[PDB]
Swiss-Prot record, chain A:
The chain holds residues 248 to 296 of 1381 of the full protein. Self-assembles to form an icosahedral capsid with a T=16 symmetry, about 200 nm in diameter, and consisting of 150 hexons and 12 pentons (total of 162 capsomers). Hexons form the edges and faces of the capsid and are each composed of six MCP molecules. In contrast, one penton is found at each of the 12 vertices. Eleven of the pentons are MCP pentamers, while the last vertex is occupied by the portal complex. This is Major capsid protein. The gene is MCP. Homomultimer. Makes the hexons and eleven out of twelve pentons. Interacts with triplex proteins 1/TRX1 and 2/TRX2; adjacent capsomers are linked together in groups of three by triplexes, heterotrimeric complexes composed of one molecule of TRX1 and two molecules of TRX2. Interacts with scaffold protein; this interaction allows efficient MCP transport to the host nucleus. Interacts with capsid vertex component 2/CVC2. Interacts with the small capsomere-interacting protein/SCP. Coiled coil: none annotated. It is found in: Virion; Host nucleus. Belongs to the herpesviridae major capsid protein family.
Curated annotation (Swiss-Prot), chain D:
This is Major capsid protein. Belongs to the herpesviridae major capsid protein family. Homomultimer. Makes the hexons and eleven out of twelve pentons. Interacts with triplex proteins 1/TRX1 and 2/TRX2; adjacent capsomers are linked together in groups of three by triplexes, heterotrimeric complexes composed of one molecule of TRX1 and two molecules of TRX2. Interacts with scaffold protein; this interaction allows efficient MCP transport to the host nucleus. Interacts with capsid vertex component 2/CVC2. Interacts with the small capsomere-interacting protein/SCP. The chain holds residues 149 to 198 of 1381 of the full protein. Transmembrane segments: none annotated. Self-assembles to form an icosahedral capsid with a T=16 symmetry, about 200 nm in diameter, and consisting of 150 hexons and 12 pentons (total of 162 capsomers). Hexons form the edges and faces of the capsid and are each composed of six MCP molecules. In contrast, one penton is found at each of the 12 vertices. Eleven of the pentons are MCP pentamers, while the last vertex is occupied by the portal complex. The gene is MCP. It is found in: Virion; Host nucleus.
Amino acid sequence: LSEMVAAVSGESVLKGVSTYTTAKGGEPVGGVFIVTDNVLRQLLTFLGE
Amino acid sequence: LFHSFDLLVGKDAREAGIKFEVLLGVYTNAIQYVRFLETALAVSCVNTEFKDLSRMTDGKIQFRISV
Amino acid sequence: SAAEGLFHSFDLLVGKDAREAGIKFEVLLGVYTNAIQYVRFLETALAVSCVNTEFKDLSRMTDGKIQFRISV
Amino acid sequence: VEYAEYVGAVKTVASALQFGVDALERGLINTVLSVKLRHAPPMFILQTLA
C-alpha cells in the first residue's frame, strides 16, 4: 500500500488548501482506496486498527 | 476580472493564479437589421395589427364599388 | 487556433459607444502553476555535514589555503 | 488593459527571479553532494584502511 502511495502521489498542477481533513488527528487525507467487500473485510484485519 | 476563477485555481498568488498571455483580434460581423416600417415597400401596403388571423375564416371580401 | 485553451476576461472595443461589431481585441488570460518546493541548504539535513560561510567576494579570491601543523 | 499587462509582467519577472534563485540553491546542494562524492572512498577500502 505504501508503495502504491509513493508511486501515485507526485507532481500535480492546480493545487490548493488541505481538502478533506479527518476528525481524530485533523490531518489531510492523501488518497482513497476503492475496493470490494472481501478485500475490505480482509484489510481491516491485516492492518487491524 | 469578469469571471469566477477563484476556487478553481486556489488562493495563493505565488504558486498559482491568472496571467495575461495573448492579445487576439477577430472580426465580428455586422448585419443590417431591417424592419418593415424602416424599409420603403411599406408604402404600398397599409399594415394593421389584426392580432388573430383565425377571426376571418372566409377567404373572400366584399367590395362596394360606387361610381 | 491560439484560443484553444485560454479563458478570456473582457474585450477592447474600438471607440464604439453603442456598437457591438467591428474589430474586437480580447484579453486571452492564462492559468499558471508554480510547482516548486522551497528547499534551502540550511533546511536540509545535509547542512550538518558542512560549515557554511557567507563569503561575499569569492570571485576575487583565486586560491585557498589552510595549514595544519601536526605535533607528533 | 495595461494594468492587466503590468501584473502579468510582474508575475513573470518575480517568478523567473524565484526560478533562478531556487535553481541556484539546487545547484548548490548538487555541487555540495558532488564535492562530498569526489572525496568519498568506498566502504570496502575504508573497512580496512581506517
